[PDB]
């Protein structure tokens, strides 16, 4: 009896979404000049990891970034002079994610052990020691994003997200509703909402303070691997195993553009945006990175220097450069 | 060029590099294996034998040593049923041990499907599988009793003849050898019907309480590495 009512509600929502559409983004963006051809070449190459690099994150100051490797190591590098500031060994070798505090005083990591470990960088003794160990998830940790040095949001492979409290160690809020395991996370610019993407071709919008689900976006035909927010804060871009990228907007509750090509068959592992939102960078399985025009949805550039699958990719806070990390255990920086 | 403090930072980075080199030397000399099996075989007992000779933990590791060679074995713990996402972390392991309970034929097709799924995988190519036909003690009793027997689970039985290669020294009658070699030929068909030249399969006949289980793994890993090195030089 509830199946029919759910079907009726879904049909009503679909009709309401169809009604609000009058034109498309391609028609409106048809009469402006293109961006031309983009030439980016590597400036720095960072070496020192032993196995494939699973994640990375840039600091607030745009000079220090942290990388995580599956040999069981975290490394904190200096970007300008290529120096190594810290090298931290972990208790588990299967680390799938890592984040950096906005304050710059802590670091987080986690993996197949279902524990989120928080390390303190500013210690009276000249060493880095683990300060907290958050437990309570019943699956591997996929992503973690940090908040005001005392709160952290984590997504897990048991189809749940959690808002924690480092001081006490207890989790304050739990977000449920996904069917497949959650693979990525992006905080809103105003850190009042956040979107998540799961392995059932669906993304969801979450309110941090209330703890409830606001909207659900379904436009993909396979599991979603990466997701992020448009600088303005009113739209998001996602990446899926169907070799296509999609752009959604919160205000209209719809999908605006699809980025795909005929020759591309592999999957998409990471998605990023430019400081002005014009460009969209995406890492692919065929050892390549692609740079797309976000408005005209026309391929604009490409990247290389990687001999294996590209896993992580991130743009700096001021828009100066972009960092890439693949499964050959090398990190590259491009202007 | 550099100021008085830049040189100290450079020296600190060099020291970190030296420590990383030592860790690389230690990390290159161990072998990692992945253990797999259902909640029907004696995988826990096989682990217990080697280990004697946290509330929601995700993975368990056991270390052992054969002829001064270190082996690390990982098996997953509190994880969900779907495994198509975390199986990509193990694309650079020496081998995958796969334990199958061959006593019951009620759920043998599920084991065959699991083996086929593991064999054909985009990221699990060039990885060799060591097969453990465990609990081949209740199998003989099940065959001898006759209350339950392979008659309708698989329709191709009673039309199979034992190949002229078996070495059935331990046995009471020549009727369990045919059944166990039929099971072995079952899993061996999937491995022989797919991509070859990159990875192989190494079957065994084991019982859960056995004395020689680490030596078989030692021998199979020796064979795997030797074949890779003999194929990198066009000698094979």
């Amino acid at each position, epitope marked *: 009896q509830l199946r029919q009512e759910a079907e009726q509600l879904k049909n009503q929502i679909r009709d309401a979404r169809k009604a609000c559409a009058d034109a498309t983004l391609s028609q409106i963006t048809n009469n402006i000049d293109p961006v031309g051809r983009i030439q980016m070449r590597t400036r720095r190459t960072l070496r020192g990891h032993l196995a494939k690099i699973y994640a990375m994150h840039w600091g607030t100051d745009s*000079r*220090l970034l942290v990388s995580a490797s599956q040999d069981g190591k975290l490394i904190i590098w*200096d970007s300008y002079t290529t*120096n190594k*500031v810290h090298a931290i060994p972990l208790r588990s070798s299967w680390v799938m994610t890592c984040a950096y505090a906005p304050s710059g005083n802590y670091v987080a990591c986690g993996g197949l052990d279902n524990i989120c470990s928080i390390y303190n960088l500013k210690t*009276r*003794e*000249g*060493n880095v020691r683990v300060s907290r160990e958050l437990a309570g998830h019943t699956g591997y940790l996929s992503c973690c994003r940090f908040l005001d040095d005392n709160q952290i949001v984590t997504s897990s492979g048991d189809t749940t997200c959690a808002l924690w409290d480092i001081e006490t160690g207890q989790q304050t809020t739990t977000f449920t509703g996904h069917t497949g395991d959650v693979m990525s996370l992006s905080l809103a610019p105003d850190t009042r909402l956040f979107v998540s993407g799961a392995c059932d071709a669906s993304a969801k919008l979450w309110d941090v303070r209330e703890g409830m689900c606001r909207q659900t976006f379904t436009g993909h035909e396979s599991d979603i691997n990466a997701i992020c927010f448009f600088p303005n804060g009113n739209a998001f871009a996602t990446g899926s195993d169907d070799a296509t990228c999609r752009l959604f907007d919160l205000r209209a509750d719809q999908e605006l553009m699809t980025y795909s090509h005929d020759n591309i068959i592999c999957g998409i592992t990471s998605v990023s945006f430019s400081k002005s939102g014009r460009l969209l960078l995406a890492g692919y399985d065929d050892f390549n990175c692609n740079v797309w025009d976000a408005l005209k949805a026309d391929r604009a550039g490409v990247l290389a220097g990687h001999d294996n699958r590209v896993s992580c990719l991130g743009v700096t806070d001021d828009g100066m450069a972009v960092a890439t990390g693949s499964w050959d255990s090398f990190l590259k920086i491009w202007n | 060029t550099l*100021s*008085a*403090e*830049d040189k*100290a*930072a450079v*020296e*600190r980075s060099k*020291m970190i590099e030296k420590q990383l080199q030592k860790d690389k030397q230690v990390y290159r000399a161990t072998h990692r294996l992945l253990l797999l099996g259902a909640d029907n075989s004696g995988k826990s007992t096989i682990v217990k034998q080697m280990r004697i000779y946290v509330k929601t933990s995700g993975i368990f590791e056991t270390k052992f040593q054969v002829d001064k060679v270190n082996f690390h074995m990982f098996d997953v713990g509190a994880q969900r049923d779907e495994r198509r996402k975390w199986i990509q972390c193990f694309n650079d392991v020496t081998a995958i041990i796969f334990v199958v309970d061959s006593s019951d034929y009620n759920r043998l097709q599920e084991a065959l499907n699991d083996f086929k799924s593991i064999w054909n995988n985009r990221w699990l190519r060039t990885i060799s599988v060591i097969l453990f036909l465990n609990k081949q003690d209740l199998l003989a009793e099940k065959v001898l009793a006759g209350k339950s027997k392979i008659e309708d689970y698989f329709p191709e039985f009673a039309r199979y003849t034992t190949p002229e290669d078996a070495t059935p020294e331990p046995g009471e009658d020549p009727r369990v050898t045919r059944a166990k070699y039929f099971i072995r030929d079952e899993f061996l068909r999937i491995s022989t019907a797919s991509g070859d030249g990159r990875h192989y399969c190494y079957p065994h006949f084991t019982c859960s309480v056995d004395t020689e289980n680490a030596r078989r793994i030692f021998n199979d890993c020796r064979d795997i590495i030797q074949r890779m090195h003999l194929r990198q030089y066009e000698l094979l």
Partner: single-chain antibody
Amino acid sequence: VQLVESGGGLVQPGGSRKLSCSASGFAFSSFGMHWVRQAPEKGLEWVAYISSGSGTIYYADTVKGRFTISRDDPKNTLFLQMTSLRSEDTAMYYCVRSIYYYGSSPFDFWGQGTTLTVSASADIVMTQATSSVPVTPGESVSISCRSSKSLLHSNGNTYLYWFLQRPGQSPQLLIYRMSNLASGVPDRFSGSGSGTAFTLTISRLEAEDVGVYYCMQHLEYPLTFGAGTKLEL
């Protein structure tokens, strides 16, 4: 964190002595160490520097061929061997730690010191404005330091340090790199400069600011301190 100094006493001219520095409470092997001496009624004077891993050693020009510095990492100890003690080597010696990487703060802990008595160049120079300042509680005070070279480097750092020594105590870090507050120093203190002239400002003077204030440079390895400025309440 603790550093304890052993050795000293009364020595005859032409003799020899050994001084020990024992560290407890922090990772001794990750820090570089310095010796800093102070005359009975004068300022401070940097003496010797030992790096981390014992890969670099620096000496002052006046003690180049007489003093030796060494480490014992497993036992967490620092050694200074002194030979042919003259009458100008009668000073109180302090053990200092410092760690160098991106964003660190060197010279952030000093020992208590030990006392030793003996019976009978193109380098940067720093000048303190005045040797005394009469002020009252509750008001604002300003101190000045000057240099003979532009302490600003090409990267963008300045390398100027402000230390304070209270009566009957040891120096403590106040300001590092001319615009950064120390770990637990009160917010009232401030620092500023322009490349050649530098100024330290105290906004709301209190009872505990009484002492001698020193500036110091770290652009080059020959380390000069200066004379300092005294404050009286």
